[PDB]
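Researcher: Batch entry, complex prediction.
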Amino acid sequence: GKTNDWLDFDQLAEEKVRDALKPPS
Amino acid sequence: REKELERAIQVLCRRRKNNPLLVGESGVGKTAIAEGLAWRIVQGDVPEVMADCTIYSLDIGSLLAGTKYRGDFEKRFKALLKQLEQDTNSILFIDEIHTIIGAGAASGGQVDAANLIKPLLSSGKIRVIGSTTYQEFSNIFEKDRALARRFQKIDITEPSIEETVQIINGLKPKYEAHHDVRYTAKAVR
Amino acid sequence: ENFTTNLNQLARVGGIDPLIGREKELERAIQVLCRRRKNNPLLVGESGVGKTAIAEGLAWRIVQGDVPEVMADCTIYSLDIGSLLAGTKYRGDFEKRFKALLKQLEQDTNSILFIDEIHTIIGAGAASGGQVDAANLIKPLLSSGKIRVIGSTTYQEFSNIFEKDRALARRFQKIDITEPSIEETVQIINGLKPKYEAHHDVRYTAKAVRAAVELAVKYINDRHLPDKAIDVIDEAGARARLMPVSKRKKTVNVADIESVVARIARIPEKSVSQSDRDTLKNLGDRLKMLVFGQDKAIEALTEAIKMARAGLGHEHKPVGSFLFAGPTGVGKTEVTVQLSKALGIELLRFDMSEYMERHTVSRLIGAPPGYVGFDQGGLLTDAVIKHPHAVLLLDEIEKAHPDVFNILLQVMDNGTLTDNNGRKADFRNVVLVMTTNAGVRETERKSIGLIHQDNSTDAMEEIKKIFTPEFRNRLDNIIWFDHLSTDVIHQVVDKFIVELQVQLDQKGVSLEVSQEARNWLAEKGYDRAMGARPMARVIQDNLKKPLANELLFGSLVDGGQVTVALDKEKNELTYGFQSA
Ligand SMILES: Nc1ncnc2c1ncn2[C@@H]1O[C@H](COP(=O)(O)OP(=O)(O)OP(O)(O)=S)[C@@H](O)[C@H]1O
Ligand SMILES: Nc1ncnc2c1ncn2[C@@H]1O[C@H](COP(=O)(O)OP(=O)(O)OP(O)(O)=S)[C@@H](O)[C@H]1O
Ligand SMILES: Nc1ncnc2c1ncn2[C@@H]1O[C@H](COP(=O)(O)OP(=O)(O)OP(O)(O)=S)[C@@H](O)[C@H]1O
Ligand SMILES: [Mg+2]
Ligand SMILES: [Mg+2]
Ligand SMILES: [Mg+2]
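Model: Structure tokens for the complex:
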């Protein structure tokens, strides 16, 4: 019997960034 | 928990990096040791060096309540540290300390509670007690080598069968009053 | 105004610890300041090495006067990035605050700005289209060279964040800082010792300071040598200050340092207390009282532990690595399970039958970074870190893939294993006991002849074939388990009967068994090829089975008083079944 082959699974990375505000006056 | 609390008091009495970190598995009484330290101080069964000290619990959710504008978190957090330095006899308890590592970054900045506290922990101006799980400590807290160095990892081990029955006996008066029932000596064992 | 702090003024009041050594690095940094180009020094180093002390310590030397005449009059300021962003609510606040500070420095040309963790300003405050990066604001001044600033960063941060900013990187001149040697670290403690001594009102012994730098580096491997030693020194002072009455410990002896390094490193301490000596010495019958026979197996486990606690042990290898082979039903695993109970330490079990496939190794050491299972982490590394002093049990090791054996080579020879996160697991105090079933087929096999031959040698050949010589050269001992003798079975029967009594005691039933009945069960269930496991079946069918019918629906609901006897006439057991 031929040897088995394993397949890896790569997870993508994406994140959300907050936003600070600066009033003019 | 005399051995655990004695090591914590020893770390809190150091000159520099006097910031214990109660690392242990969930359910091993990490918060109990930190929160119970205050209960012991009021009762009076603590070393004289630890008496007269006030322990405060930090709610990270309340700091970021209205931090919409830039600098609201920095000013709010920095002002809090000034209060501890003034009295120089107050301790800060930050449960789930792994959260403050990334809190306060607005869009792409590294300015956070970790960097804001870092220079104040290596100098010994303030004392902070931490509590976090092994998974969080290994995967998140351990990543920041600078912050990890300042914190003295105090390991908490699961108690034995005999050590647990005395704990329930001490807690039993609080649970009996809630349900208005009584527990037998055999039921606890 | 209030964002910065004059480190030179702070030194005048003792706010900065003194510097010891680091002459080569200080000269390098001072030289980088004097040069016309690339005047901004940078201090790349690992966490704890002392890079921050060098930047702040420079001010201490200036006030002292032990610096060159050119660097004799220069104000050193420490930039607190947190204070800059304190009141930066309205637009233009960051520009005014940052520009106002730079104006004071460029006009003077003598003041120098020390910015710790300069990688933080690379992503300074930006809210809506402003893109006012602190690096961009200071970039033009650094190019001309009018103002010079000192920097500090980690290797990761310098490469992950600071290297990306090529414009800043070219102006800054990297200075590599390395942890001092053990001989140099003791001098540092001697210089810092008076400050710690005054705070704790103690006096560290010259021998003790040396042990702190040697014991910590030997056991504590999670921190660099300069801060690691100071932590032991600082913590030892507090432990002596918290003495029960009148501060009995007025000096820190070597013994105190050893106790401080044992608790910090979660390892057994030296000069074992009398409480532990009793159980160690008494561990000659407790194991023999539960696991009968195989005395040589118990001696190897107890001797390796005694040697480690006594102080005579391998420098980097575990306390003991053993391979338990033998027939089925022998106490290969029971002796290991009962060893942790005798010592009162956590038992780490790992059924190696689950690791038959080569790709299954990922759950032991952990998946690589960027994978779905990276967060889960390794099972062996985490367990060892949580319980450094524990008994590891790799049951059914023969079933595992040969790749798994390679992982244990490093554990036995080096005692350090690297996980996905990079943490080093300490195997110095963990016991390694891996039970193997290799060659068991030959053990129960009967020779083709009148006289049955001993297949013990043939079984060892299978163990030598499956395990390469490298694996067998790192194991402290290979203990073949011999078959259970007739007399030994009598002891095994008593053990199972005791367990039955404990089970009946919970229900409130007692059990009395005659000596003749015990001998009958032994000869009936005795099987040299099947070990002691069949003895539990005889007890189940002859004792537990009748009692179960009576316990559920019978007179033996409570009170017990059961008696068992065998009549030679019928050659069968007699059950009392007293209601009580
Ligand atoms: N020595 C003790 N005395 C009294 N209660 C104890 C003691 N040790 C543990 N406990 C109990 O343990 C609980 C407190 O610890 P936990 O609720 O596990 O908090 P924690 O350790 O911060 O949790 P996470 O999930 O790890 S953040 C309460 O039920 C306590 O009564
Ligand atoms: N010459 C010295 N060498 C080593 N340690 C020293 C020296 N002088 C004083 N120390 C003490 O040991 C510490 C050395 O590390 P620090 O300079 O504090 O680390 P750091 O640069 O803040 O660390 P990170 O991880 O980079 S934030 C000093 O803060 C003092 O407590
Ligand atoms: N020498 C012994 N003394 C007392 N009980 C024993 C002895 N040997 C085996 N037993 C009992 O028989 C069972 C043995 O269980 P384990 O030790 O886990 O078996 P094992 O050694 O893994 O088995 P194999 O077949 O050799 S892989 C338990 O019920 C033990 O209590
Ligand atoms: Mg909690
Ligand atoms: Mg630093
Ligand atoms: Mg086995």
